[PDB]
Amino acid sequence: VHMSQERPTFYRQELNKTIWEVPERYQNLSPVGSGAYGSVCAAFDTKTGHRVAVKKLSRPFQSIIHAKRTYRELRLLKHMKHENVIGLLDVFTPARSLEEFNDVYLVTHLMGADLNNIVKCQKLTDDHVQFLIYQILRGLKYIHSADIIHRDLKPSNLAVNEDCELKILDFGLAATRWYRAPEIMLNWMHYNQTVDIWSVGCIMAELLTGRTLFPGTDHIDQLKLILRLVGTPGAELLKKISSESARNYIQSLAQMPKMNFANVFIGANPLAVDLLEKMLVLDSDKRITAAQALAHAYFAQYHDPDDEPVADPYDQSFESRDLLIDEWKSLTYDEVISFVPPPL
């Protein structure tokens, strides 16, 4: 391949009954977990001197659905270049050609402590909460500007280091429901980027109080807890709900007013409570956006409009393509080949 990177030396090892063939660069691999779509080892990146997560995708081209999902994840990870968002440090295959291309490895930021983990051994100050939520919204302004929706924000998807610096991880490539917006939990209407703002509101409330905000046990129990705080849907929102059955169910509920959040959160920063009221609006079209939230006075000590960048536009037209397995595979291989590592 014209002007491609030199192929590193690979070495083979079996780890949890899985063959891993990775460049010499990655040393001291040790298993961290396994999902349905791949398994993850922590490793020492001898090129950067950092510990990294190396994900080997599990049979990435098994079907059309899996092959397209593999391409979607690689396209997503290659696009995102932001301090508060997971970035692709490396992607490699041991294959020297498309004909032997079978395995895909993704190298990213190693999840040490997530947000749940950091509260288990300390009490966060309001300064800590301000900075953590600011970084989530700064990352979200970036991904939303490219028309990317995370879809599954929760504390276990937010990595935090010892400097209280945060990265958004584990994007939804399309479990607890406590952080999910009501309009997607019951499929009331289409996914909008406003669903990520709802999740931030749930996360922030939990960081401020130490209690999960809506810890329901099923979808109905959860909806009733949500509606108790934010009120039943008004007539404007009911018009936007597409399923008639969902509308009839909502209209069957005893009407409830929105609660006064200041009563619910006595002792919390009033600017924090004001921001929460703007994030946990039931109508998604009235929720504050990530860009607007960064300008809220709650973040006055961190907000810098010259240091809150937006993303390049992200071409998602591939999503409407209907291709053979080997075509998605060939597209994925092209993206592995075209990958340019980040500097340093």
Partner: peptide, 7 residues
């Protein structure tokens, strides 16, 4: 913002 302990 200062510093956090690792669990």
């Amino acid at each position: 913002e200062m510093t956090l302990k690792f669990g």
